[PDB]
Symmetry: C3
Subunit: 146 residues, 3 copies
């Protein structure tokens, strides 16, 4: 597998520092999966309605022209009401700090216990358009929907 297949020639490298090397490197659960799963570095208990800012133990260098996106996992979302307050979290190209996940318990009654080493979110990487705004007085000067 050190040979990059023709179909993966243009695939993107993401530099990562394991700030907590006791956690595995994030990985795709299955071939073709959009995201790599991020771990919790911490034990945390969330009562109903409470949030926390949870360390993942990693820092990344998203390439210029791209964005990292932190999305909730669907299983925990349905089973226990686990969500992310700022979802999708937006990780900028220039960020060199630790990725942190703003977990929240949206269940009305049952606490959520997160253990160190649990997979608590997924990180996608996508291209983004670094847009140049052009201010106009009206869209004329410059649709079905309107």
């Amino acid at each position: 597998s050190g040979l990059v297949p023709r179909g993966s020639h243009m695939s993107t490298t993401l530099a990562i520092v394991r700030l907590d090397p006791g956690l595995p490197l994030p990985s795709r659960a299955h071939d073709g999966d959009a995201g790599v799963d991020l771990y919790s570095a911490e034990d945390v208990e969330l009562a109903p309605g409470r949030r926390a800012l949870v360390r993942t133990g990693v820092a990344v260098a998203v390439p210029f022209g791209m964005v990292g996106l932190v999305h909730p996992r669907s299983g925990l979302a349905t089973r226990v009401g686990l969500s992310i307050v700022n979802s999708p979290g937006t990780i900028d190209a220039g960020y060199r700090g630790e990725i942190k996940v703003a977990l929240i318990n949206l269940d009305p009654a049952a606490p959520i216990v997160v253990h160190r080493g649990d997979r608590i979110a997924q990180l996608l990487v996508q291209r983004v358009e670094l847009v140049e705004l052009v201010e106009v007085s009206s869209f004329d000067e410059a649709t079905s929907r309107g």
Copy 2:
């Protein structure tokens, strides 16, 4: 319209199975819209704060190198506080099951009634970078923000 116009030459086909053929195929509400609207196959009532995992009656084959993304509709979000616990839901290229939507009622007091055949979310399809992680000891070895 069987002729693919020059400007749509590179547009992507998405194979879909209507597991519930009583529902219309998902469609864009207007030309240029980012997403196709997903239907509920089910009647569901959500008391304030409650969630459900709602069947959409479809399965798709997102192409390798892409991702499907399940987003809430803005009208229901404002009018009645309808949201999605794991938003944006992440549909992987390898998934061949039914798309399910984790609806939640974020209103404090009024129940939300969803009927079979209502449009309850929107599905976008985007390219994703299937990233190769490169572990480094520091970003040096390998920004304004820092």
Copy 3:
């Protein structure tokens, strides 16, 4: 800076109307940032659990083949529990109205005060696949995960 550098040759213009010209044009907080920050045109107070549909004072013309995406800011999300009900908000290419943000207070006890001129969300622009659905009876006729 009127010269487009070789590396920004293909970067995208976004036409914008300041419907409220008392607010600054949205901008990236730092070079390489994925999104430009949207302002509130309004003063709004959100009690715990309450939502509002907040005017941003801008209208944009997202290019055909692209999507605008309204994401929460991470600082307010952690500090005070500020979220967006329909996050990520989906701004279609054909939309020429004012961008509105569906803010919600997910804190259990403390109200959130938003002032006119505060930065309350971020707007990304990305390509989207305008998909052509092909209905199949089974995926055969037309994976690790299954």
